C-alpha cells in the first residue's frame, strides 16, 4: 500500500481521493493520505473553501514514482511533485505515520467501486490526453477545454480526447450517407476500434477517464466525450456481444456512483432516452436501464 504525503495544509480545502473526500481546516496538521491501493490509477482533487470555483486535481499511479503534495503560495494551488530521492521520501513518510497526521484511504473490503470505475484506465493513456510529459502525473480541472471544443484555446492545457463527430467525413463513407449515419457501425468498428483505439479496452479507458473528469471536476468537455462515446456504441447496429455486456457494467457503476443531485448537469436527457429506448441497443443495457429507471425516472 502507498502513501501521498503533504508538506502542509496552509489554506482551508476539501480534499478528494477517488470517490472519498475529507475537509481540512486552514493550517490543520494534515500530512497526507496512506494505505492507497496499489494496482489502479488514482485522482487526488481539491476545492478551496473560499473559491469553490476551479476544482482541480492529479491523476497518478504510485507504481510510476514517489509523489507528494505541496501548496504553492505564488500560484495558489496544491501541487503534485515527484520526490526523486527515495530514502528522503521513506523518511518523510515514516515520520508522519508514527505521528498519525495522515488519513487512511478508507476502502470497505467488499467494495469494488473504484476498480469498476477505472477498470480500463491506464496512466500511459491519461498522459496522451493530458500532455505534459515532464511529469508522470496529469493535472486536470473544471475549465480545461477539449481539442474538439478548441476547433468550434491554449493547446498546452487542452484535454486531447479522441474527436468523435457523427456529421464528419471521418464518420460518413462517400456513398453510404444514410447507412453510415443511422447505423454508425463502420464509424465505431472500423474507424475508431480497428483504426484509432486498436481495441475495446482503450475505447472504454477513455470513456471512463472522461466520465470521472466530468464527475470530479464538472468538466463540461469530458461530459460531452463520455456521452459521445456512449452514443457511438448505442447507435451502432453491429457491436461485439462482450463490449455490450462490459458497457452495461461500466455505465451501471458510473450511474450508481453519480451524486443524486448532479443528474441535472452531468446526464444528457436526449442521449440516454435514445440509448435506452430508441437505439439499436435499447435492449442490451439491462443493468444500466434498471438503475437509471429506479434512481433517475425524472430524466426518462
Amino acid at each position: 500500500m502507498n502513501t501521498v504525503p503533504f508538506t502542509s495544509a496552509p489554506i482551508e480545502v476539501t480534499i478528494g481521493i477517488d470517490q472519498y473526500s475529507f475537509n481540512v481546516k486552514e493550517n490543520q496538521p494534515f500530512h497526507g493520505i496512506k494505505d492507497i491501493p496499489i494496482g489502479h490509477v488514482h485522482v487526488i482533487h481539491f476545492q478551496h473553501a473560499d473559491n469553490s470555483s476551479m476544482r482541480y486535481g492529479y491523476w497518478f499511479d504510485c507504481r510510476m514514482g514517489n509523489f507528494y503534495i505541496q501548496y504553492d503560495p505564488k500560484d495558489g494551488l496544491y501541487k503534485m511533485m515527484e520526490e526523486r530521492d527515495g530514502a528522503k521520501f521513506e523518511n518523510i513518510v515514516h515520520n508522519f505515520k508514527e505521528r498519525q497526521m495522515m488519513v487512511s484511504y478508507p476502502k470497505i473490503d467488499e467494495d469494488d467501486t473504484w476498480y469498476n470505475l477505472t477498470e480500463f484506465v491506464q496512466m500511459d493513456k491519461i498522459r496522451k490526453i493530458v500532455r505534459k510529459d515532464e511529469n508522470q502525473f496529469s493535472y486536470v480541472d473544471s475549465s480545461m477545454t477539449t481539442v474538439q471544443e478548441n476547433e468550434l484555446s491554449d493547446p498546452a492545457h487542452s484535454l486531447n480526447y479522441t474527436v468523435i463527430n457523427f456529421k464528419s467525413r471521418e464518420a460518413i463513407r462517400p456513398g453510404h450517407e444514410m447507412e453510415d449515419f443511422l447505423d454508425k457501425s463502420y464509424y465505431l468498428n472500423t474507424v475508431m476500434l480497428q483504426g484509432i483505439f486498436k481495441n475495446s479496452s482503450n475505447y472504454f479507458g477513455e470513456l471512463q477517464f472522461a466520465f470521472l473528469n466530468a464527475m470530479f471536476f464538472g468538466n463540461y468537455g469530458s461530459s460531452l466525450q463520455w456521452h459521445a462515446m456512449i452514443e457511438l456504441i448505442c447507435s451502432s447496429a453491429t457491436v461485439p456481444k462482450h463490449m455490450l455486456d462490459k458497457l452495461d457494467e461500466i455505465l451501471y457503476y458510473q450511474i450508481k456512483t453519480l451524486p443524486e443531485q448532479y443528474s441535472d448537469i452531468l446526464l444528457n436527457e436526449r442521449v440516454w432516452n435514445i440509448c435506452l429506448y430508441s437505439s439499436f441497443q435499447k435492449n442490451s443495457l439491462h443493468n444500466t436501464e434498471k438503475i437509471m429507471e429506479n434512481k433517475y425516472p425524472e430524466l426518462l
Binding site: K167, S168, R169, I172, E177, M178, F181
Partner: protein, 237 residues
C-alpha cells in the same frame, strides 16, 4: 440558422440560393386489398428545387422504381432528396453552385448536411415560413411531366415564365406564393380563376397564362379573396 420574414429580402440578393421541398418526393394512393386490409401504391414524385431570384426550377422526377424493395420509404425519401440535391450541386460549375440551400422541412437538415459534407462553404438552412410549394403538383404542366415519366429524369422549368422582364424577384416570388397558397387552399376555385377566359393562353414553354399587368392585378385580387373565403369557412370566422 433559420429563415423568417425579418430577413425576407435575403432571398432576392446576389448569393445563389435554392429552396428544397421534399413534400412530393414520396406519393402513395392508399387502397383496399382483396382480403380487406390496406396497401399503398407509390406514384411518381418530384423534388422541388427552386432558385427564388431567377425562377429556375430544377424539378427532379422521382420514378416509382427508386422505391422497389426498399424499407421505411418516408425516411428513404428525405435521403433520396439529399442525394439528388448533392448531385445537382456537383454537376454545376463552381460559379453556379448555391451559397445556401433552404429546406422547407426540418427533417431534411441532417440528410442534406450529411450529403453535403464535401461542400462546407454551403449553408444548409431551415425556414420558419409556411411556404406553399406542396401545391406544385396543382400546376398542370408539372403534374403531366411527373405522371408521364417512365424513368428518373430532370426538367429545368422557369416557374416565373417571362415575368422578370416586367417585375422584380420579390414581386414574382410573392405572385408565385400567392398562386400556390390559392391552389393548396381550393385547387378547384384557384384553377377556375386562372382559365375562365379562353382568350388568355399559356405559352408552350410557360406554366401560367400570358396575363397583361392589369389582368395579373385582377387575378392577384381574386386569389387573395379565395384564400380568405376558405379561411372564414375552415374556421367559421
Amino acid at each position: 440558422g433559420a429563415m423568417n420574414s425579418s430577413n425576407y429580402a435575403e432571398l432576392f440578393n446576389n448569393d445563389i440560393k435554392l429552396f428544397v421541398d421534399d413534400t412530393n418526393v414520396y406519393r402513395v394512393t392508399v387502397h383496399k386489398t382483396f382480403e380487406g386490409n390496406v396497401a399503398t401504391k407509390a406514384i411518381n414524385g418530384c423534388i422541388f428545387t427552386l432558385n427564388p431570384k431567377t425562377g429556375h426550377l430544377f424539378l427532379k422526377i422521382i420514378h416509382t422504381s427508386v422505391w422497389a424493395g426498399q424499407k421505411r420509404l418516408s425516411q428513404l425519401a428525405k435521403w433520396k432528396t439529399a442525394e439528388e440535391v448533392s448531385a445537382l450541386v456537383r454537376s454545376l460549375p463552381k460559379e453556379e453552385q448555391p451559397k445556401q440551400i433552404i429546406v422547407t422541412r426540418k427533417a431534411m437538415l441532417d440528410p442534406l448536411e450529411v450529403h453535403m459534407l464535401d461542400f462546407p462553404n454551403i449553408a444548409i438552412r431551415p425556414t420558419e415560413l409556411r411556404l406553399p410549394f406542396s401545391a406544385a403538383m396543382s400546376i398542370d404542366k408539372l403534374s403531366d411531366v411527373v405522371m408521364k415519366a417512365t424513368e428518373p429524369q430532370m426538367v429545368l422549368f422557369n416557374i416565373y415564365d417571362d415575368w422578370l422582364d416586367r417585375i422584380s424577384s420579390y414581386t414574382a416570388f410573392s405572385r408565385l406564393t400567392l398562386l400556390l397558397r390559392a391552389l393548396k387552399t381550393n385547387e378547384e376555385s384557384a384553377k377556375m380563376i386562372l382559365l375562365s377566359d379562353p382568350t388568355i393562353t399559356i405559352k408552350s414553354y410557360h406554366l401560367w397564362p400570358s396575363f397583361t399587368d392589369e389582368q395579373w392585378i385582377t387575378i392577384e385580387s381574386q386569389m387573395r379573396d379565395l384564400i380568405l373565403t376558405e379561411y372564414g369557412r375552415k374556421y367559421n370566422v
